[PDB]
């Protein structure tokens, strides 16, 4: 180990470039309820592709 001398702040600023997040940038609208939900995932109310399942 033993860094012989310290890196800059600019350096680590570059190391953290690719570390940035990527946004989903896509959502859906329920076939019935009109709710916002992910693709292939159920709505909070449980509606998936217009069908009700959980009822909890």
């Amino acid at each position: 180990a033993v860094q012989q001398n310290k890196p800059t702040r600019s350096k680590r600023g570059m190391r953290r470039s690719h570390d940035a997040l990527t946004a989903v940038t896509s959502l859906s609208v329920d076939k019935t309820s009109g709710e916002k939900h992910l693709r292939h995932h159920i709505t909070a109310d449980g509606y998936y592709r217009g069908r009700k399942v959980i009822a909890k």
Partner: protein, 110 residues
């Protein structure tokens, strides 16, 4: 318009929090909440609660007008770092830092 909001003395590292902020700047309000909700981090819930307040902090205290609104100035500035020990082998201790990050949100029509 103004009506900022802020959270202070949070328990989190500004670095971490600073990732979420980049995902929303200049953006429409409603999108963020939709972005943060389905984003997964400990901070998204934290920061979102703030942003939720700035709005509610507006219409009661000022002209409201949500449907046309924007996030202009968001940033993070670190707060105090609490001092704690995690011991180690051979008897040496180590000073560890619980790091805290102040937050600021500025939401405006322009």
């Amino acid at each position: 318009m103004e009506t900022i909001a802020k959270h202070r003395h949070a328990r989190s590292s500004a670095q971490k929090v600073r990732l979420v902020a980049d995902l929303i700047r200049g953006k429409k309000v409603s999108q963020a909440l939709d972005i943060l909700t389905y984003t997964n981090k400990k901070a998204a819930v934290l920061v979102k609660k703030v942003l939720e307040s700035a709005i509610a902090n507006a219409e009661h205290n000022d002209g409201a007008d949500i449907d046309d609104l924007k996030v202009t100035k968001i940033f993070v500035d670190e707060g105090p770092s609490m001092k704690r020990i995690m011991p180690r082998a051979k008897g040496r201790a180590d000073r560890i830092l619980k790091r805290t990050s102040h937050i600021t949100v500025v939401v405006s029509d322009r």
